Structure formats: structure tokens, C-alpha cells
């Protein structure tokens, strides 16, 4: 068999049937004779390609396969890759390389020093030393991406390799099964369980790897057993807990002092599936106040190592959550009382307040809706006002890299056809990956895009005035017509300058049979 | 003085007065109290920021200064850096890093292993070990970018550094002057001149570094003295010679066999300011046919080392071209005859052939127009049909990375206010950096954008012929409305469905007060 | 032709006829059928291999070729490579890699991520993508090492490549000539010459690239014309000037404040072939005092970029030194004030003072002796007491990496059979590369080795004083018998416990026909 045929066979045997890509000349020999059991999804820019694949991988909880061209194509996708790195997204990125005969003279589109290009944003980066090695390298890529802690990997393939003969021994690769579904040994797990059973005032903190593992329901059981308040770790890329559950206490603020204040008086704090901690603002103080013991369960040795406090256990989040949920005793403490409903903000007849927008979405969206957030100044309000009952209901750029939400919403919608995806995106953020809209239109992927338009980079104006930073240039983004942009890429577009129009637009958008974009005029 | 004040002083004293940027939290302490003698040019995505800065740097023949945010921002720009690497563009890229106090815990927006991120696409990549080192590091960056062979450099700065005290000895940095304006020693230069005088049938091949050095007129004199035909090296990122000069023989095809056939019978071939050679298609054969001797003058050691044939001299192109032009004898041979005018392609009353478009541009554009090309299937016809008399008249993505031309056209137009810039861009390529249009509208930079719309990735459909690949997905991009996209970003838009409308549209565009996009319906 | 035959022809044609190595299985297919016009020099450990090659390259002023095995062999040599990087030594390091068929499984002795291994200590690092590419990759290595600024390069070759067919077009590589022998353009050079002519009190600082280019005689003429005092730049790897010439001032102390003090009152300071500057101890102060301008001529863009003061010219040291020496006017100023004579230290009849040793060497050694220095606490005294009249008379580890001088002295002696090499090496330093002695014995390379045995790491004790660092462990090295070590590796050995034994031993060593080691008991 050829390297071409052996590689597609490996891919299908390992459960891959979708290729997200932007084609180039170096990939033509790979994409030719594209198999009838595969699906190719085109996006117009590589950041969109990777964003869509990322959304798809995260929602499906399986690896996604990407095909890009050389250094320029890989390069356009590296911002998206930084998000994928922080979110532990299992992404297999393949980039076509020049023919081996012309690599040395550095012909046009030679990816020079290819393996170094995507570093340090990938778990593994590689260019095979011969064509016959390509299937084996692809097998490595698949498993490196899928093993805990999951993450993006990169494989550079000279285009002449595809037509060459494969090694007959490559068949041994097709059905390899590799597991990292592990948990703490019985002896030490018993000790952990006793420490939790003995806690007088435990608290639980959940990170994105809980949602990735679909460990949400086990964490609900654990919280109910321990009668413990539950927080989501700061800079949250996903939602790991039902937000209207009585134990739920919200998104933690991304500051050192703020977090140790929140945790004060809790004797044991169990952190599951989060780094400790993804702080953002500088808010100096104690990591923990006296009397608090922290125990971290993480799938990532790099996270366990860099925690500035606490004990850590490096294991699979799914296996650990289920073990813990089922081993801890039912505490006799009273179940925490549910957080109060958030107050209704005064809304006049003019431009919409973000709070008003979220209340309205919450009233009108289906219960199994999925939200993506890239409205950077309104994140706290979003978390308080959206009732997210199910797993996989929320996505936010894990490395804070704008350009994620718009394309990721398309990938999520593709992965979850029966759940309505609603992307809430600021007017600033919408531009980074605007051409992703075209893919929604072309494949009829019924994502709803809600653009929050206040004409400015709001989160920066906040980060600014608070440092007393005066005279900062480039904070304003006037003169963008999002309905025109939507029309530009073939997506139905509506506007909402006030509450009445917002309700009407949402009514229409939810009834639509294709992608819809709604431009919302919001207050500054 | 603070690091902030010392660094802006260094920048102004080194001739920098413009910052191209997309802002983020880590940059706020750098951008605050922005000096009144500097201007800030905002673009909505980092690929666009770098593209605009690149165009500006290439046209101005001076380094350009870029400011981006952390890993996500740098990453979004790496495709653009790939082009900048190949074009030897002097770009100073600064990226804001997290505060030193939070780098260890990897707070959100920490650029991990920062200096490795942009590698291998930069000449130098660095993060300073302390705040007081920042001005010295910036000095290194400016000079590393500006010295031959020019190219992009990367500097990562923790945001807390800017408010700190600078080293008082930093003042020594302000007026440093660093020269690489060197040429071959007299004795060896005399030997080279002898070999050129002695050739019975010399040919000259010129690359982009001629135009970067503004050595074009010196090369004209050289070609006229030697009575030698002149080719442009393949995959040309710039135009180094008047295209209607009688010696001019056109753009070399980017193939091994095609070039050695083209050079057959020329006893000495002098290549100036080009890699030897930037082939693209695989076209195996002889690098040179017997009887042909090749001598390369390059500013880049990496180019000289990797040439698979010929002698090489590593020196400054401007100094070498001037010296050669002034030392060679006037040959007694007859001056080459000008190439025949290209044939008129027949044009009916329907969709435009690319040839018609280029003929019409040539008839209507000012004699000092600047063209940018990202119409990938029409490059050969463009080179045959545009009379470009002056230096700095042509730009094409040097690494073959799409997304360059649209933003670069804005930078070039910014650098050359008295020269009408006309970007010819395919419908596929226009999408990679579509949001750049906003910067043109916002700063009123009157670039003309000509969108060649044939609904497909034409150059890929062709490369898919030489390779004979069938059933390739993702080659079609129907359903994009470029007038609406232009409207979306505030740029005046026009359409041309046939020749009459093309003339009418171009006429309106050429006299317009602001940027203008023209959507042209082209064949195939 | 095979890759093997083609590669040895390339080496032969590029002037290489010696392979310095330590063999491994991955190199057997390269080393088999070893050509009769080549010689192999074996050393017992890779730091010794590179050290010997390094000495040979520096003294011969031509590239040297090295063959090591995979990652372990390359790794053992990486300390020696750091010295090579700092000395601009043109070393071509080839490392054998596993067969391409077993790279993927990471069989034993697979050099994983090979090209990254020696970074950042090499100008260029590479593994070819196919067997046919090997001669071209070797061509690139050769030229990269040889172009200014010279330095080490690294090529990793899978062992199965050697027997494969070479590209027939590889013959074009054989006779390629690549030149970087360049100097400043006429206009700016005249400006420089006028600045030097107009200076009222000029000073000259010379670095190792002067001796590397053999520009010593031109620098003497320049200094005589300007009547200028000449210093050698700090941490000097070579000696660029006759140390008893009337202009010579001595070796600059490696401190910021010390140097600006030495240069005070000089209106123009011309630095040639040195970094500005290789400081060592932290001696905070002014880089230059007011009233002094500095102009640096360097072959290395990295040096020009990082100088914290002065202007810079990046050009070939040989060409520039020659041009300047012949262009500047003869000044009528008085020569520098004669330097004082080094004091004779009172010597009892016991252990030797280093000053006694150096005075005795200077009396008894031939006028064209070549010295190597790795006696770290005595460097200042060595420079004050040895009259070195000729070029290529001094070597010292350029990166301060011990283990250089012993093997380098053998390489130098091999390159300069008619000049007596005398390596002065501390008892501590001698151990890093002790096995090199065997190579001197086996090939009968008549190097003389003077071990300064004071039983401690003297320089560290000093450096500890200027820090008031108390209770440092590991500074003493008692119980080493160097005569027994010499016997172990087959080298004649003598001992010198006092002055009369020192004179006797040197007399005998100078008369010997093979290598000789003398152990000298020196004061604590
Ligand atoms: C790729 C990238 N570029 C820039 C930033 C910096 N940044 C953070 S928030 C922000 C503002 C986004 O504005 P918008 O999307 O309209 O949301 P708003 O703050 O107004 O709610 C910017 C530019 C970033 N995080 N990532
Ligand atoms: C960043 C990047 N992505 C993808 C490619 C591959 N590529 C080369 S040509 C081409 C087609 C461009 O189409 P268009 O701009 O409409 O011009 P046409 O070929 O039809 O004339 C593509 C997708 C590339 N070179 N760079
Ligand atoms: C590879 C390496 N290891 C350690 C050192 C640190 N070092 C600098 S000087 C020195 C002492 C050298 O001792 P010796 O050779 O006996 O000379 P002495 O100082 O006594 O004159 C050491 C260990 C170094 N420079 N390089
Ligand atoms: Ca906004
Ligand atoms: Ca097209
Ligand atoms: Ca000692
Ligand atoms: Mg990288
Ligand atoms: Mg005009």
C-alpha cells in the first residue's frame, strides 16, 4: 500500500473522519483521492481552521484533525494554538512540507526548521526522516494528542512522501489502544478520602478539565456528599458545574489576594481539573491564609509542578472524580444555600446594558443551549445570569487569545447538531476571525452569533483607568457594520438597538434554519 | 529616568516615530503617556498589524516598529513573520509579557518560553533579565533588524519593567550608528570585474534585495555596460529593474530545468540580491548546463551557503552594485533588443480575463503607481503586462504566505503618499487579512484594492494539474460579497462585471479621496 | 557515485584533509574505505576531539573537520563548542545518526531532535531530509563555518545515507568559492579615516579576530602611524599585537569601571576584532567617560548589536585592518610613555611563584614559542611577563570553559610543527581533558605541558574574596600525581619543586623529541 492509503486507514481505524483545513500546494498529494468516508471542512484563514477544529474537539471530547500548508499556514494558526495549549485540546495539526529533493535549497514554501515553528505551543512536534515512517509518525501524533494531559501536536510531511510505498508492518498501528485513564493507588486514595471525610469546612474548586472529562455529574455528587461550596477556577475556559445548583458559588476572580480571601476559613480546599491558579490581574497578597490546606487533582504534571502551594495528585480527571464521588461519606452538614437570583438592572429605552442582554438570552434560549464568550468586559455578568444546567455549555479562550469564539462556535455547533450554539462576542473580538462566518454559511451550520457593539475595547479601558494609565492610543474601534460583514460572508443578519428589537431578533434567530448574526448596540 | 522614557528617547533618536499595533493588557504600561511626536496605527488583527508594518518598512527602506500582546498576539502574526523573513524586512516586534511577579505561576497571558515562540522566523529573539536592561535590549533589536541581511526580530518585555528606573548609562545607546555598508576588497573586486569584462555572453539575474537597496539604477547601468539580458529571480517578492528596458527578459519560471535551459549558452551569469534560486514547482534537471558559470552577490550568508552552484560574495547590495556598475567596461556587443509587447487577449462582453485587467491597469494607472500582487494564478501575466519604470513598484508575499498584500498595500501607501498604490488580490487571498480594510478607512489611507473574483482557489486547481491530483476538496470559495465586506469596514466599494464597468470603476477609484475596493468578475 | 565518495571529494576539493574524531557505530559507514589522502586523528573523549580540532583550526586559520557519534558524543563535546563559539573557530562537526528506518522508534543511539542538541552554540545545525541531500548539506556546513563571523556548525547524518546514490548534480558543489572578505564603502571609509587623522589622542583596542585574520602586522602599522597606545580587549582568547612593542599597553582588566578609567582622556577609541567588551567581574560604573567616542570594527553582527556604546562597522577584520593601516596619515605625536618593567618577585628555594615561572619561561623559551594559558589565577602576570613578538603566539579558552588548553595545545602543535608549543595549565584545569595527552603520545606531537600545581582552584578562591564569600566547599584538589597521569597516557614526565629544578626541566623538555609534561610545585 502507499503511505497515502495506509495513513487514511490509520486515521479511520483511530476514529477520525473529519479534516479541518485550508489547502495549499504541499497538501495536494495528501488531499487527492479524498476518501468517501471522510468529510473536509474548509475555512478561509488558518486561525479559523484551528478555531473550528478546536471547538469541535472540545465539544466532542475526541481528537480533531487539521491540515494546513507550510510555515505561513502554520504561522497564521499559532495564536489559535496558544488557546488550544491552555485548554488541553486534542488537536492533530499536519502541515504540508516541500518535496524532499528541494528542502535543502529552501524552495518557496519550504517550512524551514519545521518542528521548531509551533514550539512551545505543542506537546510534540516532528518531521519524519523518510516517507515510510509517515504512518508511524501519524500514530505518534494521534496518541500524543489524546493522552492526558491532552493537547495539540504538529507533524510536518514532505509532499512527495504520500505516493511512496508504506512499510508493510504499519498495519500494527491501526488498532493500537492507548490508555491514560488512571487514578491514585488504593492506599493513598484512602488517605485522601479520610482527609475529605474529616474536613470540618471543605470547599471545592473546579477547572476546565472537569468538563473535558465529562466529570461534571461526579463532581455534583461529590459536592452534595461533602455538602461543600463549589467555585469555578479563574479565567475559566469551560463550565464544569451546573450554575444554578445550590452548591455553586460562581467564577472566582483572577487575583491572588481575592482568592485566598474567598477561601479563608475553609480547612481543606480540593481543586480538580484546574491549574493553581490561572490568575490574571496582579493582586498581591497571600496565596492561602493560615488554616487552609489545598489539595490539587490535575491531569497535567506542568500544572502540579508550578502550583505555589498545596499537595497535588497527577491522574485522569474522569477516573479520579468518579472514585472520589463514590468513596466519600455523606456528610451531616447542611447543604449550602443556593446563590440569590441576580438583580434586574435599570434599562431605559436606549442602548442595551450587558446585564439586560444576558437576562434576555437566559429567558429565551433553550435549556440545552451552548454559550461561547468573547465579550471580554462582561464575563462576570455572563456567569451570574446564564443558567447552564448541562455539561459542555460554555467556552472561553483559554489563553485569553481573541479570535477563538467565533470559529469555535461553528465547530461546537457541528459537533452538537441538536444543541443551539449562541456565541456572545464583542465588536473588537469579532474581527480577529471574521472570515469564519463563511464556513457557517457554506455548510449550513446554524450557529447564532450575538455581537455586543459598544465601539471600544472595553476590557482594556478598564485595565487602563485602573492603572491610572492616561493617553493610551488604539482603544477605540468605531465604524464597523457587522450586518454588512455578515452579508459579506452569506450569513443572515439582524440588528437590535433596544430591548424590543433584541427580543424580536432573538425570536427570529432561534426560529432560523441556518446561521444568524445579531448586532446588538450596547452601552459604553 | 524611567525605562518608559528612556526607551521612547532611544526610539526617536534611532529614527522611529510610528508604532503599528493591536493593544493588550501587557502593553498598557508601554502605551500610556504615548509621546506626542509618535503616531500609533491600530489594526484589528495581528497578521494585519505586521503586514501593514512590513509594507511600510519595505517601501520606506527603514525599520518599522510593532507592538503586540503576549503569545496569542505574537502567534496571530507568525504567518506574516514568515513572509517578512523571506523578504529581509527590518521589523522590530515587541510583545508585552506578564508582570515578573506572575511569570512563574503562568498567570493568564504569560508568554511561556517567549523567545522560542517566533523562532525560527526571526534573526534574534530575546527577553531581558531585568527592567534596567530593557533599553539595551531594544537597542540590540533595532540594530539586529537593520544590519544586513535585514529581517524581523522579537523582544518580549514584562509589563512592570516600564515604570522602573533605567540605567543612567543607557544614554550611550541613543546615537549609536551601526554600518554594514561593505563591499568586496579591491583586489578581489578587480578580479570579478575582469571576469565580467571577459564574458562573451553574460546574463544578469536580479532579486528583491536590489530593490530594497535602491540599487535598481546601478543595475540598469551595469546591464547597459555589459550589454546583458536581465531576468528577475523566481518567486520575486519585489521588482528590481524597469520592466520595459530593452535588456529586460522577465520573471524566471520557478523551476530547476526551466532556469538552466533559460541560461544555456550564457558563459557567465551574475546574480545580484537573490537566493539561488527560489524554485517552487519541482522541475528536475540540471542546476546549470555545461559552459555556464554562476557568480552570486548576496547580503545573506545563509543564501550564499545553500546555493547548490556557483561562487558567492557576501556583501551589501547597494555598495556592490554601485561599485560594479562604475568599474565594468562598456562592452562592444550590441545592446539587447526589447522584448515584444504582449499579445492582446480577446475579450467579449462578459467576465474579465486577467490579461484584460492588467492591460487596462497599465493603460490607466499613473506611471509611478505601486502594485501589490496576491492574485496567485495570474502572476506571470501581471509581470508581462505592467510597465513598472521606477524602484519600489511591486510587492508579492516573499514566503508565499497569503494575507500579506492587503495589509501591506496600506503600509506602502502610508510610506509613499504621492504614489498611487494598487493591490491586485484574488478572492481567495483577500480573506486572510480582510480586517486590514478598517485601518485604511480609519486613517484615510487611499489604497486601491482590486479583487479578482473567479470563485475558486485558481492556482491550486492548476498545481493540481502538474501533480495530476483528482477529487481534491476545498478548492472552491463561492458566495463571498466583497462590496459588503468593504462596506462592513467603511471602505467605498465598486463592482466591475465587464470591461466597460472596469474602466468606469478604475476611473472613479483613481481619483477618489479615500480607499476604494473594486470587485472584478474574472474568468474561470 | 555514492554519497560517501561524493562527500569525500567535496571535502578534498574544499581543502579538508584531516578528520578529528572519536568513532561510533553510526559513523562506520562514513569512516569505511577511509581515503588515502586523508588522515584521522583519534582522541579518547569528545571534548578532547573538539579541543584538538579547535587548536588546529585557530592556528592554521582554516576550517577543521570533526566526526563524533550521535547524542552522547555530541553532548560530551558541548563545553568545547562553547569555547569555539566565542573564538569564532570554523569547526565542521558531523555526528552519526541512526539508520532512517529506526529513527522513529528511537532505537539506541538515535539522536532525538538532533539539530536542537548543540543549539545555541553553533551558527548552523541541520539533519538532511534525504541521503541525496547529504553532499549539499555538507557544502552548506563548510561555507557556514567559513564565512565571517566564523564559527562551529553541526550536521547530523543517518548512517544508511552514505551508501546511497548522490545527486548527479552534486558536482556543482565541489569548487564553489564563497567570499566574505569585505570592507566599508569608500565614502564612509574616508569619513572614518578623517576621524582617525583628526583625533588629538586616539587609542586602539584589539581583540582575537585580529590574530585570526593575521592582521597583526597591519595593526602595528596603524598604531605606529597614529602613535596610539594599544590595549588587548579583556578576557583575550588570542594575542593580536607584539607585547613588547612601544605602543603596547597590556591586557585590559575585564571590568566596566576599570576600562572606562583606562580609556579616559582619549577622544577617539578604535576597537578592532573584539566584542565591546568581554567583561567578567562585576565592576559597575561608566561604560565610557564623557569626551570619548568609540568606533568598533567587528566581523560579527551579534557583537555590533550588543555593544552598549559607540558606533560599529561590520566587516572583515583583515580587509579593514589593511585598508586603515594604508590610508591613515603619519602623526608627528610622541609614542606612548614606555611601560614599567615587571618586578622580580623574591623567590626562596621552595615552591615557585607564578611570576618566577613566567620570568624563566620568557628567558628560556624560543622567540617564536606559542603559549596556551589555562592557569586561571595567573593570567595577568602571564601577560605582563611573556614577550610574544609574533602572530598566533597565545591561546586561552574564549568562553572561559576549562578543558580547552591541553587538547588545543596538541592541535596547535600539529598545525605549527616548527614552532614550540608550551601550554601553561593549572592543576585543576588539567583534569577536564586529561586523556588528550594520549593523542600527543600516539601521533608524537611534541607539545610541552607545564602544570602549575598549587593544589587548589586558585581563581575561585580569589573571586570569592571580592565577594567576601565564606565557607565555600569544593575549592581544593589535593592528591593528584601528574607524572603518573602522564605515564598512564605514554608521555614523558618531569617534576620541578624549585627554581633550579625548573630550569633543568625546561632545558630537558626543550631538547626532547616527543611531548613532555612538567609538574611544577607553585605557591598557594
Ligand atoms: C489576539 C489578541 N489580541 C489582543 C488582545 C487584547 N485584548 C483583550 S480584551 C480586548 C478587548 C476586546 O474588545 P471586545 O471584543 O469588543 O470586548 P469588550 O472588552 O468591549 O467587552 C483586547 C484587544 C488579546 N487578548 N488577544
Ligand atoms: C496562509 C496561506 N494559506 C494557504 C495557501 C495556499 N494557496 C496558494 S495559492 C492559493 C489560492 C489563492 O487563490 P486566489 O487568491 O483567489 O487567487 P487565484 O489562484 O485564483 O488566482 C492558496 C489557497 C498559502 N499559500 N498561504
Ligand atoms: C568547564 C568549567 N568548569 C569549572 C569552571 C570554573 N573555574 C574557573 S577557574 C577555576 C579554577 C582553575 O583551577 P587551576 O586550573 O588549578 O588554576 P588556578 O586558578 O589555581 O590558577 C574553575 C574551577 C570553568 N571555568 N569551566
Ligand atoms: Ca467592545
Ligand atoms: Ca480566485
Ligand atoms: Ca591550581
Ligand atoms: Mg517557535
Ligand atoms: Mg489617487
Amino acid at each position: 500500500a502507499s503511505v497515502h492509503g495506509t495513513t487514511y486507514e490509520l486515521l479511520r481505524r483511530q476514529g477520525i473522519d473529519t479534516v479541518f483545513g485550508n489547502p495549499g500546494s504541499n497538501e495536494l498529494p495528501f488531499l487527492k483521492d479524498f476518501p468517501e468516508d471522510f468529510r473536509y471542512i474548509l475555512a478561509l484563514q488558518e486561525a479559523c481552521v484551528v478555531g473550528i477544529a478546536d471547538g469541535y474537539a472540545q465539544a466532542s471530547r475526541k481528537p480533531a484533525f487539521i491540515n494546513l500548508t507550510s510555515a505561513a499556514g502554520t504561522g497564521n494558526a499559532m495564536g489559535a494554538l496558544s488557546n488550544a495549549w491552555n485548554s488541553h485540546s486534542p488537536l492533530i495539526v499536519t502541515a504540508g512540507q516541500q518535496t524532499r529533493a528541494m528542502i535543502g535549497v529552501e524552495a518557496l514554501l519550504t517550512n524551514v526548521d519545521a518542528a521548531n515553528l509551533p514550539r512551545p505551543l505543542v506537546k510534540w512536534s516532528y518531521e519524519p526522516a523518510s516517507a515510510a515512517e509517515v504512518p508511524h509518525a501519524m500514530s505518534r501524533a494521534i496518541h500524543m494528542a489524546s493522552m492526558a494531559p491532552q493537547g495539540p501536536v504538529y507533524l510536518s510531511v514532505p509532499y512527495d512522501d504520500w505516493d511512496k510505498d508504506a512499510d508493510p508492518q504499519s498495519h500494527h498501528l491501526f488498532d493500537r489502544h492507548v490508555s491514560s485513564s488512571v487514578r491514585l493507588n488504593d492506599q493513598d486514595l484512602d488517605i485522601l478520602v479520610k482527609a475529605l471525610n474529616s474536613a470540618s469546612n471543605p470547599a471545592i474548586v473546579l477547572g476546565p478539565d472537569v468538563d473535558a472529562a465529562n466529570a461534571n455529574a461526579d463532581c455534583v455528587m461529590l459536592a452534595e456528599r461533602l455538602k461543600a461550596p463549589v467555585w469555578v477556577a479563574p479565567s475559566a475556559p469551560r463550565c464544569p458545574f451546573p450554575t444554578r445548583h445550590p452548591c455553586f458559588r460562581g467564577l472566582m476572580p483572577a487575583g491572588i489576594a481575592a482568592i485566598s480571601q474567598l477561601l479563608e476559613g475553609h480547612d481543606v480546599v480540593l481543586v480538580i481539573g484546574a491549574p493553581v491558579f490561572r490568575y490574571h490581574q496582579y493582586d498581591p497578597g497571600q496565596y492561602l491564609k493560615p488554616g487552609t490546606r489545598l489539595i490539587s487533582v490535575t491531569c497535567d504534571p506542568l500544572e502540579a509542578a508550578r502550583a505555589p502551594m498545596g499537595d497535588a495528585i497527577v491522574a485522569d480527571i474522569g477516573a479520579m472524580a468518579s472514585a472520589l464521588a463514590n468513596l466519600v461519606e455523606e456528610s451531616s452538614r447542611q447543604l449550602p444555600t443556593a446563590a440569590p437570583e441576580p438583580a434586574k438592572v435599570d434599562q431605559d429605552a436606549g442602548r442595551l446594558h450587558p446585564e439586560t442582554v444576558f437576562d434576555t438570552l437566559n429567558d429565551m434560549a433553550p435549556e440545552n443551549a451552548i454559550y461561547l464568550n468573547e465579550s471580554t468586559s462582561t464575563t462576570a455578568q455572563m456567569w451570574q445570569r446564564l443558567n447552564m444546567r448541562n455539561p459542555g455549555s460554555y467556552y472561553f479562550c483559554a489563553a485569553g487569545g481573541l479570535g477563538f469564539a467565533l470559529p469555535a462556535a461553528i465547530g461546537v455547533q457541528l459537533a452538537e447538531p441538536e444543541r443551539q450554539v449562541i456565541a456572545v462576542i464583542g465588536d473588537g473580538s469579532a474581527n480577529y476571525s471574521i472570515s469564519a462566518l463563511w464556513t457557517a454559511a457554506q455548510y449550513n451550520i446554524p450557529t447564532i452569533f450575538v455581537i455586543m457593539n459598544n465601539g471600544t475595547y472595553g476590557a482594556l479601558r478598564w485595565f487602563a483607568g485602573v492603572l491610572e494609565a492616561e493617553n493610551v492610543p488604539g482603544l477605540d474601534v468605531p465604524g464597523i457594520d457587522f450586518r454588512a460583514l455578515a452579508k459579506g460572508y452569506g450569513v443572515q443578519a439582524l440588528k437590535a438597538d433596544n430591548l424590543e428589537q433584541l427580543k424580536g431578533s432573538l425570536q427570529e434567530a432561534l426560529s432560523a434554519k441556518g446561521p444568524v448574526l445579531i448586532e446588538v448596540s450596547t452601552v459604553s
Side-chain angles (χ1 to χ4, degrees), chain A:
Chain A
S2 68
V3 170
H4 186 277
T6 302
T7 300
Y8 279 105
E9 183 58 26
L10 169 62
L11 291 169
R12 68 173 58 90
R13 296 277 277 279
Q14 291 287 322
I16 296 157
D17 58 25
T18 301
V19 171
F20 300 86
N22 183 260
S25 53
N26 291 342
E27 302 70 49
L28 296 180
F30 170 69
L31 296 169
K32 72 181 176 190
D33 298 324
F34 195 72
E36 292 178 44
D37 63 321
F38 282 69
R39 173 170 61 175
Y40 186 98
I41 304 284
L42 174 68
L44 298 175
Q45 209 262 8
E46 288 84 0
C48 306
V49 170
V50 173
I52 294 170
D54 195 349
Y56 187 77
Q58 291 194 60
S60 66
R61 298 182 172 88
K62 293 183 173 180
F65 186 89
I66 295 160
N67 186 234
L68 304 182
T69 197
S70 209
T74 298
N76 281 349
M78 291 293 296
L81 286 182
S82 73
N83 285 321
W85 172 264
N86 276 30
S87 64
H88 292 136
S89 310
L91 299 185
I92 305 160
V93 186
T94 65
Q97 165 71 285
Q98 259 283 6
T99 185
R100 286 181 190 272
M102 282 206 300
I103 287 174
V105 305
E106 292 188 16
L108 195 65
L109 293 149
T110 297
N111 194 344
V112 175
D113 201 20
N116 279 340
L117 178 55
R119 302 181 162 138
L121 301 185
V122 290
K123 295 182 60 171
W124 187 70
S125 190
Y126 192 71
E127 182 169 284
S130 71
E133 185 189 354
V134 168
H136 181 230
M138 184 70 70
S139 176
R140 292 170 81 183
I142 290 167
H143 299 301
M144 284 305 299
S146 309
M147 282 177 296
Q150 295 186 324
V153 299
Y154 187 78
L155 183 63
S156 180
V157 182
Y159 77 75
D160 58 325
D161 289 353
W162 300 112
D163 296 336
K164 302 299 183 53
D165 292 327
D167 175 15
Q169 284 299 289
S170 290
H171 71 80
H172 292 288
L173 307 167
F174 296 156
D175 295 327
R176 291 199 66 227
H177 181 268
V178 177
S179 173
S180 46
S181 178
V182 296
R183 50 82 160 179
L184 193 56
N185 68 82
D186 287 344
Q187 176 170 302
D188 295 330
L189 183 57
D190 284 334
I191 296 180
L192 172 55
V193 178
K194 287 170 183 142
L196 300 174
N197 286 340
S198 285
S200 57
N201 191 28
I204 297 173
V205 182
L206 305 179
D209 300 313
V210 169
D211 192 46
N214 201 10
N216 313 48
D218 289 329
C219 289
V220 164
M221 181 175 175
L222 179 64
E224 290 175 348
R225 238 109 170 86
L226 298 173
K227 305 287 185 286
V230 169
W231 301 86
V232 180
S235 305
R238 298 179 71 145
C239 182
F241 205 79
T243 58
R244 287 306 196 269
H245 187 277
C247 293
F248 193 64
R249 287 299 176 265
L251 172 67
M252 302 177 112
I256 291 165
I259 279 168
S260 61
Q261 189 63 65
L262 242 26
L263 295 176
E264 192 182 28
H266 290 289
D267 59 338
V268 178
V269 175
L270 187 66
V271 186
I272 307 182
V276 178
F277 282 115
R278 197 78 74 183
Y279 304 115
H280 184 17
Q281 59 266 31
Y282 192 44
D283 181 22
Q286 297 163 288
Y287 285 121
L288 287 177
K289 294 193 171 298
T292 295
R293 217 252 278 204
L294 185 144
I295 303 175
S296 178
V297 181
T298 167
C299 61
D300 191 346
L302 293 167
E303 292 178 356
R306 72 177 186 263
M309 66 295 194
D311 296 338
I313 299 157
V314 181
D316 180 83
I317 297 310
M320 282 292 290
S322 176
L324 292 171
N326 289 290
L327 290 167
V328 295
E329 292 171 3
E330 169 84 359
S331 166
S332 63
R333 287 183 300 275
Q334 38 199 9
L335 197 71
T337 38
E341 211 74 36
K344 184 195 184 71
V345 168
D346 290 334
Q347 177 64 61
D348 72 21
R351 303 177 67 97
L352 289 155
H353 292 279
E355 296 81 337
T356 305
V357 176
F358 295 122
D359 291 349
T360 304
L361 281 165
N362 190 49
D363 294 335
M364 299 182 60
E367 68 89 21
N368 64 342
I370 299 165
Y371 300 93
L372 287 90
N373 174 23
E374 210 163 273
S375 174
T376 39
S377 69
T378 63
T379 293
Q381 299 97 303
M382 192 170 190
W383 270 94
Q384 291 171 28
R385 304 180 176 269
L386 295 189
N387 180 348
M388 297 181 279
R389 301 164 175 82
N390 307 289
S393 300
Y394 178 90
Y395 302 93
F396 171 80
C397 53
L402 306 181
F404 168 78
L406 206 155
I410 296 171
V412 175
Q413 188 61 90
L414 186 63
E416 289 286 354
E418 286 135 47
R419 300 184 59 183
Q420 183 62 69
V421 176
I422 304 177
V424 183
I425 302 169
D427 55 320
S429 296
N431 300 294
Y432 291 82
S433 281
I434 195 73
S435 70
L437 289 176
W438 184 85
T439 301
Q442 290 295 305
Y443 296 95
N444 198 45
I445 298 172
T447 305
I448 295 175
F449 307 92
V450 171
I451 315 303
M452 309 276 286
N453 187 3
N454 61 18
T456 188
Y457 284 144
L460 297 185
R461 291 190 158 285
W462 185 80
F463 214 95
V466 307
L467 315 196
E468 198 183 9
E470 271 180 50
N471 287 305
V472 178
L475 299 192
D476 294 325
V477 288
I480 304 171
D481 179 347
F482 292 94
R483 293 150 72 201
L485 290 178
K487 177 183 176 177
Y489 285 120
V491 170
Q492 172 185 354
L494 308 167
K495 109 250 177 172
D497 297 320
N498 61 43
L499 188 46
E500 193 192 2
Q501 293 174 21
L502 181 52
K503 297 174 176 181
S505 295
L506 286 174
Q507 289 174 4
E508 186 161 6
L510 295 166
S511 310
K513 281 299 179 180
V516 178
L517 178 148
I518 307 175
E519 174 174 358
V520 181
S521 309
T522 62
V523 290
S524 102

